[PDB]
A paper describes a structure:
To translocate on solid surfaces many bacteria use dynamic cell surface structures called type IVa pili (T4aP). T4aP undergo cycles of extension, adhesion to a surface, and retraction that generate a force sufficient to pull a cell forward. The T4aP filament is composed of thousands of copies of the major pilin. Here, using cryo-EM, we solve the structure of the T4aP of Myxococcus xanthus (T4aPMx), which has an unusual large major pilin called PilA.
For structure determination of T4aPMx, we purified T4aP from the hyperpiliated ΔpilT strain, in which T4aP are extended but not retracted, thereby allowing the purification of T4aP of sufficient purity and quantity for structural analyses. We used cryo-EM to determine the structure of the T4aPMx and obtained the structure at 3.0 Å resolution, the highest resolution so far reported for a T4aP structure. The subunits in the filament are related to each other by an azimuthal rotation of 100.7° and an axial rise per subunit of 10.0 Å, generating a right-handed 1-start helix with a pitch of ~36 Å and 3.6 subunits per turn, as determined from the power spectrum of the filaments. The filaments are ~7 nm in diameter and, in contrast to all previous T4aP structures, resemble a rather solid cylinder without the corrugation of the surface observed in other T4aP structures. The N-terminal α1-helix of PilAMx extends from residues 3 to 54 and contains the hydrophobic α1-N (aa 3 to 18) and the amphipathic α1-C (aa 24 to 54) separated by an unfolded stretch of five residues around the conserved Pro22. The large globular domain (aa 55 to 208) contains two antiparallel β-sheets, one four-stranded sheet composed of β1-4 and one three-stranded sheet composed of β1′-3′, as well as three α-helices (α2-4). Two disulfide bridges are present in the large globular domain. C95/C102 connects and likely stabilizes the region between β1 and α3. C183/C203 connects the β’-sheet to the C-terminal part of the globular domain, somewhat similar to the C-terminal D-region known from other major T4a pilins that attaches the β-sheet to the C-terminal portion of the globular domain. Within the T4aPMx the globular domain of an individual PilA monomer extensively interacts with neighboring subunits, including six different subunit–subunit interfaces, three large (N:N-3, N:N-4, N:N-1) and three small (N:N-7, N:N-2, N:N-6).
Numbering used by the authors:
A (entry chain L), C (entry chain M), E (entry chain N): 1 to 208
B (entry chain O): 157 to 208
D (entry chain J): 53 to 208
F (entry chain G): 53 to 104
The structure:
């Protein structure tokens, strides 16, 4: 071999140093998104058990008996009722003053700037189906005043990897269908199946 | 009066032969209670501490 | 190093890009097959409760009190009696005209081409055991005319991953034994244990 | 997870890092190709079935805004009768979807013309030609329909 | 990158292929052990009902009315009285010649080499408490001759996963305490609570 | 990469620079020898086993 071959060898190792391999942060974000699914299905289960025992759905996480373990990355909202969001910013959880409809993000181990004290998801791209005319307002609907309550509606809000913006999930007791968009999938969603209104792995910005 | 799992504090139940209504709180539910139905005044699953 | 080493590095990456890993679609199909087990055991339980209260088994899912949740992937048949199979092709379930002996696949969220409106399984490789001489016909046997009814027989039919063909399950109130075959296991089956007559993970085609 | 294949890269969860040199198409559905012509990626308006070449660091004249490869020399094998149209086939209407089909398009060194790749979920066989290899291709193995290292010009 | 990196990648996948993950057969054995708990509590309930109606405890499973469903994995002994153990080695259960004090393992669907025709558990590590001076001999004690019978004592015996040796349980009508050992837990046992004398998940061999 | 040797110079990826003085044959298979008789190299009709 000659000088040109050897310089080409050097240039090839330089090329491999700057190779453009797949973005695996997307894969790791998809890995992290499973907290939302598991915890929302736990919320569904607890709501069903509470209704069975009490003939009514609940607007608060205290009565349902649902709480995710620390390190959650996601803030969970059980209803739009008034109250604080159980801020998790210390080793010891605070003593509640009243029923809590929302559970904040665990900012103890993720930093103070990562806090989510109002974990209300986006529901623009979830369309309820059926003749019962259900809405997209979170919580027990049409009102908690009807003991044979129509199906509840809940959701979560979080951040996957270093996305400045959030990803949103919803779970409903009724059938609905998703809409196609820059940050969501199209297809019918069975009752009790989490749906990703904004996934944050596809998009980052004003996209919804 | 008892204790569920590793709660330092207790949960409380009552049963009455007369009608009553529960009050909303950090550790209790709101709604009317028929005579002969146990009511959980403090449930210990929702809260642990000074909460009642 | 020299040119040959560097081209060998490139070729090794080409090799790893085309490596032959295990087929994990089979593992996921085995994951999806658990609906059939859970729902068939629920069918068994509901049939036993119905007999206990009424001194007789039923050929209809209305009377038993059994219905899987939406998104089931499997059609269930409680009997061979006449009647429509509660087609699940819309958000609102249809109002029945009479007792339904079969529950169709949930084609609302799986597409219209995936519909299973006649979920009758294959029972060739299930051999009832015992002197009572039980048959493999689905439903209450020998007839619902005998209130101390001999044990029932029921099954399910579905599709796991992208198999064009189906996998079939059965559950019986009486003992039986499985036969070895291209798509089934050999061994004795206790009463109340689902048996996979055709699994659809081992095979796809005319194999039974 | 979903019992169906996708025609959009945003739902799949796939995106190559910057400096890719290759444009990728996951389907022939309608939509823009996520033009990578600036430091900050654009906000999509809808689902994107194609990812353009990263012309930010390779120049504006090197842009590939429609990375549809050549598929003349890939022959699907099997009785299922699969096609060479890119995307989910025969159509996304069948949730037990038949295998997808995808590809890429790029330029190696100073070739004026491009080189093309395909990856399928089904079996196929390559055809001998001026710019391709002959032999059977297993499912999930990339195949080089036009390699651009052997040829440059009208050759396919 | 260079050759060393690529060979290190190959070596790392080789490492992962031989990773030492937790032994999950122990978790599955713990899952399988629930038959013993449920069926022993059923024995306890049936014995209590029989006493209430008849003012005496029974030494036979026929009179009590207790029989586990097929596929039991465990043999149950209600007394040490003489008699056969209702061998479950065929689809049709045998017609009993006389009262049966024991129920054999269901070897119909577990194989002939897994038969347990004498399911007498180990009782070395169960110490009765109280001034009444109760014993560890299985059955109605001190004798069935006293109608205000002192509390009964029963147990089960089985095999979890591929342990060559067996695991043993006991349920008593009187208070007792466990003894710490290689295959048992230490702590007080309330009357009517099954206790695992040898668990077979912790140990396999001569350990008791 | 492919678990087989090639009969053609197209697939291997081998071509000497212009001014080579030597003709190279990688196989005896049928095909033309990539005649280098002009400034622009010809477009091949099929795999070439030899380089003129």
């Amino acid at each position: 071999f000659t000088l040109i071959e050897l310089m080409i060898v050097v240039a090839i190792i330089g090329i491999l140093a700057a190779i453009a391999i797949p973005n695996f942060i997307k894969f790791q974000a998809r890995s992290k998104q499973s907290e939302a699914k598991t915890n929302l299905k736990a919320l569904y289960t607890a709501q069903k058990s509470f209704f069975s025992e009490k003939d009514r759905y609940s607007d608060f996480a205290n009565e349902i008996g649902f709480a995710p373990e620390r390190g959650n990355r996601y803030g969970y909202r059980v209803s739009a009722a008034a109250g604080d969001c159980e801020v998790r910013n210390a080793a010891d959880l605070p003593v509640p003053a009243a029923g809590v409809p929302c559970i904040s993000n665990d900012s103890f181990r993720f930093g103070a700037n990562s806090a989510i004290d109002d974990p209300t998801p986006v529901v623009a791209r979830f369309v309820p189906q059926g003749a019962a005319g259900w809405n997209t307002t979170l919580g027990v609907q049409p009102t908690i005043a009807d003991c044979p309550n129509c199906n509840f509606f809940a959701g979560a809000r979080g951040n996957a990897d270093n996305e400045a913006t959030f990803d949103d999930w919803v779970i409903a007791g009724f059938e609905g269908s998703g809409q196609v968009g820059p940050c969501s999938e199209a297809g019918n969603v069975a009752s009790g199946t989490p749906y990703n209104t904004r996934n944050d792995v596809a998009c980052d910005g004003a996209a919804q």
